[PDB]
């Protein structure tokens, strides 16, 4: 569901993407636990205030460059499971149909 | 033991043309190999020429002819010039 | 034993790139392997010939240079 | 709407042609080439030792020969109004070179 | 009298005596002309000067103080007569001339 | 001795190509062949004359031609050897 290195799913507009958790945020201690570990916010690591006080997660999207790592809060990231993949297929088909409507 | 090369003379020539330019050892080896290659090419050509004419001695004339045969155009002309002037200077000396 | 497969496709790709090739068929790699093998035997045979006539058990780079020289492919940088 | 960046086909190829037409270092892995050379050096004699420099010279000469052959193949394929090399191009190149 | 090099008498930098000895020991002919090694040393020195000059030019163009094999290859291949002379010659770590066919260029 | 390269008639070039196993010939070919042949002839004749003069002779012998061809890596038999 939500663990360091565990597979996680992340929303992005009308589409969803599988990501790998690297940092789990604990707002009370202002610390994220990372795997190559209680560590505070780094010199370049930073979380916006609207998600720094919630369960945030620093993730990399599989199939995408590491240049696109994101600090996503608990809002978009869901527990990795079968129904999540099913509604991933739902939004994939929604995008397919929207594009086909744009064309045809 | 000791092995001879052309490193010193090449170094001197380099200092003549480019009195400030260094060189790596590998370039030195390549230069030596090239010099040797030219040497054997020209020497074999001269010897073949001498045997062609049924003569016992390889003169500078044979080297001149061999250089003309092995070198293309302007290189041949300039090298012929160098050989001629050096020979004349040494003989006068 | 399939050291002929030690020449990976990426290496052949790099080699063609230095040769200035943009698009490569998939059948090329095996052809390259074969041609390279042919070349290698052709040189190594003569190299070993030289090494034997010298009554030696180790092949010296100088032998290789001689073999290349007698095959019309002069090499510098090794004496 | 998020799309991943990717160059069009032929871009990376030209970049790599530029890159490898500039440097001079060897491209083949050393150990596989050495193993292949030793394996080939068995049908002529057994238990042969090698100076490392001999293997290096072999690698250099082989790579130079292959580069020249690649370039000739490229010229052949272009002459066939194509941009992709196919083995018949190599065969024609070697045939004209007289190796065949 | 004091020993004076024959190279100095010809005003060269290549050892004419070594050249003469090698000519004698090379089994090229029974007798070797007196003025032959001078001619050969002169020619060798001239060719060496030519290649060295071109290579130094190239190395300067690369903002480098020491000639490397790459500079040598570039100089030899860029020259017409020199490349023709070394047509069948391979230089280690020489690389190749950077050259791309036009038809492969984007258009 | 001027404009003898045109003495190489087109039918001769056809015959040469046919012996080479060529079936269809362009018209823009013949001058190209003439130029290549002229280059080849110049290359051989230069060295042949070099051999002739180094012997301090006034006529060129075939034997010289054989030497010149051998030097160019194109060995010919049957002309004295």
Experimental method: cryo-EM
The neighbours of chain F, by the rule of 3 or more Cβ pairs under 8 Å, are B
Question: Is residue D48 within 8 Å of residue C59, measured between CB atoms?
Answer: yes
Q: How many CB atoms lie within 10 A of CB F47?
A: 20
Tell me if chain B has a CB within 8 Å of the CB of F71.
yes
CA atoms within 13 A on the CB side of A28: 0
The answer for residues whose C-beta is within 8 angstroms of residue E26's C-beta and 6 or more apart is B43
Q: Which residues on D lie below 8 Å from A65 (Cβ)?
A: 4
Tell me if chain B has a CB within 8 Å of the CB of F45.
no
Residue D50: C-alpha distances to residues C51, C57, D30, D41 (Å): 10, 8, 14, 10
Tell me if chain E has a CB within 8 Å of the CB of C20.
yes
E strand or H helix at B63: helix B60-70
DSSP per-residue codes, A39-97: EE--SS----HHHHSS--EEEEETTS-GGG-EEE-TTT-B---HHHHHHHHHHHHHHHH
Distance, in Å, from the CA atom of C33 to the CA atom of C5, rounded to the nearest integer, reads: 8
* Best residue of C76, C78, C79 to probe chain E, by most E CBs closer than 10 Å: C76
Measured torsion, CA atoms of residues E3, E4, E5, E8, in degrees rounded to the nearest 10: 170
Give the residue from chain C lying closest to B34, CA to CA.
C76
Residue D95: C-alpha distances to residues C16, C68, D75, E33 (Å): 19, 21, 14, 46
CATH of domain D4-100: 1.10.20.10
Question: Is residue B46 within 8 Å of residue B66, measured between CB atoms?
Answer: yes
Radius of gyration of chain A (CA): 15
* Best residue of E104, E105, E106 to probe chain D, by most D CBs closer than 10 Å: E104
**Do E100 and D14 make contact, defined as CB atoms within 8 angstroms?**
yes
**Do E100 and D74 make contact, defined as CB atoms within 8 angstroms?**
no
Distance, in Å, from the CA atom of C66 to the CA atom of C54, rounded to the nearest integer, reads: 13
Q: Given CATH 1.10.20.10, say whether it is the number of domain F1-79.
A: yes
Distance in Å from the first CA to the final CA of chain B: 36
Question: Is residue F45 within 8 Å of residue F64, measured between CB atoms?
Answer: no
Distance, in Å, from the CA atom of F45 to the CA atom of F63, rounded to the nearest integer, reads: 13
Distance, in Å, from the CA atom of C62 to the CA atom of D6, rounded to the nearest integer, reads: 49
DSSP character at residue D7: P
**Do C25 and D86 make contact, defined as CB atoms within 8 angstroms?**
yes
How far B24 CA lies from chain F's nearest CA (Å)?
35
C28 alpha carbon, distance to own chain's centre: 17
Angle (CA) C52-C53-C56 rounded to 5° is: 45
Distance, in Å, from the CA atom of B70 to the CA atom of B67, rounded to the nearest integer, reads: 5
Distance in Å from the first CA to the final CA of chain A: 39
* Binding-face residues of C in 55-74 toward D, CB within 8 A: 57-61, 63-65, 68, 73
PDB resolution in Å:
4.0
β pairing state of A70-72 and C58-59: unpaired
Distance, in Å, from the CA atom of A75 to the CA atom of A89, rounded to the nearest integer, reads: 20
**Do C73 and D20 make contact, defined as CB atoms within 8 angstroms?**
no
What are the tokens at A85? 């993949």
Q: Which residues on B lie below 8 Å from C62 (Cβ)?
A: none
β pairing state of D49-50 and C58-59: parallel
Question: Is residue F50 within 8 Å of residue B68, measured between CB atoms?
Answer: yes
Q: Which residues on D lie below 8 Å from E96 (Cβ)?
A: 21, 67
D28 alpha carbon, distance to own chain's centre: 9
Distance, in Å, from the CA atom of A91 to the CA atom of A10, rounded to the nearest integer, reads: 12
The domain segmentation of chain D, as residue ranges, is 4-100
Q: Which residues on C lie below 8 Å from D19 (Cβ)?
A: 17
Measured torsion, CA atoms of residues F44, F48, F54, F56, in degrees rounded to the nearest 10: -150
**Do D54 and C52 make contact, defined as CB atoms within 8 angstroms?**
no
Distance, in Å, from the CA atom of B38 to the CA atom of B67, rounded to the nearest integer, reads: 10
Task: Tell me the domains of chain B and their CATH numbers.
Answer: 1-93 (1.10.20.10)
Question: Is residue B57 within 8 Å of residue E32, measured between CB atoms?
Answer: yes
The domain segmentation of chain F, as residue ranges, is 1-79
DSSP character at residue F18: H
CA atoms within 13 A on the CB side of E72: 29
Question: Is residue B27 within 8 Å of residue E67, measured between CB atoms?
Answer: yes
Tell me if chain C has a CB within 8 Å of the CB of B26.
yes
What are the tokens at B18? 């480019």
Q: D87: burial class by Cβ within 10 Å (0-12, 13-18, 19+)?
A: middle
Distance, in Å, from the CA atom of E103 to the CA atom of E98, rounded to the nearest integer, reads: 16
Paired residues of A7 in beta bridges: A20
The neighbours of chain A, by the rule of 3 or more Cβ pairs under 8 Å, are D
Distance, in Å, from the CA atom of A18 to the CA atom of A30, rounded to the nearest integer, reads: 26
Q: How many CB pairs under 8 A join D and E?
A: 40
> Is the pair D, E in contact (3+ CB pairs within 8 Å)?
yes
**Which of E15-27 are b and which e, b meaning 16 or more Cβ less than 10 Å from the residue's Cβ?**
bbeebbebbeeee
* Binding-face residues of A in 11-30 toward D, CB within 8 A: 12-13, 15
**Which of C15, A72, A92, A91 minimizes the C-alpha distance to E95?**
C15
Residue A80: C-alpha distances to residues A34, A65, A87 (Å): 19, 21, 12
Distance, in Å, from the CA atom of D44 to the CA atom of D32, rounded to the nearest integer, reads: 20
Distance, in Å, from the CA atom of C15 to the CA atom of D59, rounded to the nearest integer, reads: 12
B8 alpha carbon, distance to own chain's centre: 15
**Which of F31, F9, F34, F13 minimizes the C-alpha distance to F22?**
F13
The answer for residues whose C-beta is within 8 angstroms of residue D69's C-beta and 6 or more apart is C19, C35, D90, D93, D94
CA atoms within 13 A on the CB side of A30: 6
Q: Spell out the alpha helix ranges (H) of chain F.
A: 10-19, 30-54, 62-71
DSSP per-residue codes, D9-47: TTHHHHHHHHHHTT--S--S-HHHHHHHHHHHTTSS-SS
Question: Is residue C65 within 8 Å of residue C76, measured between CB atoms?
Answer: no
Question: Is residue E40 within 8 Å of residue B67, measured between CB atoms?
Answer: no
Question: Is residue B9 within 8 Å of residue E45, measured between CB atoms?
Answer: yes
Angle (CA) D74-D80-D81 rounded to 5° is: 95
What are the tokens at E13? 């930098």
Q: How many CB atoms lie within 10 A of CB E56?
A: 22
Task: Tell me the domains of chain E and their CATH numbers.
Answer: 1-107 (1.10.20.10)
Q: How many CB pairs under 8 A join B and C?
A: 15
Question: D87-97 and D52-79 helices cross at what angle (nearest 10)?
Answer: 110
The answer for residues whose C-beta is within 8 angstroms of residue D20's C-beta and 6 or more apart is C14, C17, C18, D27
**Which of A36-48 are b and which e, b meaning 16 or more Cβ less than 10 Å from the residue's Cβ?**
eeeeeeeeeeebe
CATH topology for C1-78? Histone, subunit A (1.10.20)
Paired residues of E66 in beta bridges: B22
Angle (CA) E82-E88-E90 rounded to 5° is: 85
């Amino acid at each position: 569901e939500f663990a360091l290195g565990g597979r996680c799913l992340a929303f992005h507009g009308p589409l969803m993407y599988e990501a790998k958790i690297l940092k789990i945020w604990d707002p009370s201690s202002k610390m994220y636990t990372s795997i190559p570990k209680p560590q505070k916010l780094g010199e370049d690591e930073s979380i916006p205030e609207e998600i720094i006080n919630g369960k945030c997660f620093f993730i990399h999207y599989q199939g995408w460059k590491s240049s696109w790592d994101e600090w996503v809060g608990y809002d978009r990231i869901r527990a990795y499971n079968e129904e999540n993949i099913a509604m991933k297929k739902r939004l994939a088909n929604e995008a397919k149909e929207a594009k086909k409507s744009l064309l045809e | 033991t000791r092995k001879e090369s052309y490193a010193i003379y090449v170094y001197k020539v380099l200092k003549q043309v480019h009195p400030d330019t260094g060189i790596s050892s590998k370039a030195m080896s390549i230069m030596n190999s090239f010099v040797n290659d030219v040497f054997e090419r020209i020497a074999g050509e001269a010897s073949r020429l001498a045997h062609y004419n049924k003569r016992s001695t390889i003169t500078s004339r044979e080297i001149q002819t061999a250089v003309r045969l092995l070198l293309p155009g302007e290189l041949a002309k300039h090298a012929v010039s160098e050989g001629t002037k050096a020979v004349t200077k040494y003989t006068s000396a | 034993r399939d050291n002929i497969q030690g020449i990976t496709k990426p290496a052949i790709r790099r080699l063609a790139r230095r040769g200035g090739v943009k698009r490569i068929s998939g059948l090329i790699y095996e052809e390259t392997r074969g041609v390279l093998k042919v070349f290698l035997e052709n040189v190594i045979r003569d190299a070993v010939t030289y090494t034997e006539h010298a009554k030696r058990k180790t092949v010296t780079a100088m032998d290789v240079v001689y073999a290349l020289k007698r095959q019309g492919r002069t090499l510098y940088g090794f004496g | 709407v998020k799309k991943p960046h990717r160059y069009r086909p032929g871009t990376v190829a030209l970049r790599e042609i530029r890159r490898y037409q500039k440097s001079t270092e060897l491209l083949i892995r050393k150990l596989p080439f050495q193993r292949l050379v030793r394996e080939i050096a068995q049908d002529f004699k057994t238990d042969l030792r090698f100076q490392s420099s001999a293997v290096m010279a072999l690698q250099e000469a082989s790579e130079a020969y292959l580069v020249a052959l690649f370039e000739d193949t490229n010229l052949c394929a272009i002459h066939a109004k194509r941009v992709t090399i196919m083995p018949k191009d190599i065969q024609l190149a070697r045939r004209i070179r007289g190796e065949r | 009298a004091k020993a004076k090099t024959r190279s100095s008498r010809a005003g060269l930098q290549f050892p004419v005596g070594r050249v003469h000895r090698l000519l004698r020991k090379g089994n090229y002919a029974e007798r070797v002309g007196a003025g032959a090694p001078v001619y050969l040393a002169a020619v060798l020195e001239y060719l060496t000067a030519e290649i060295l000059e071109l290579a130094g030019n190239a190395a300067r163009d690369n903002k480098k103080t020491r000639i490397i094999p790459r500079h040598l290859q570039l100089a030899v291949r860029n020259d017409e007569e020199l490349n023709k002379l070394l047509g069948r010659v391979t230089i280690a770590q020489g690389g190749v001339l950077p050259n791309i066919q036009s038809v492969l260029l984007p258009k």
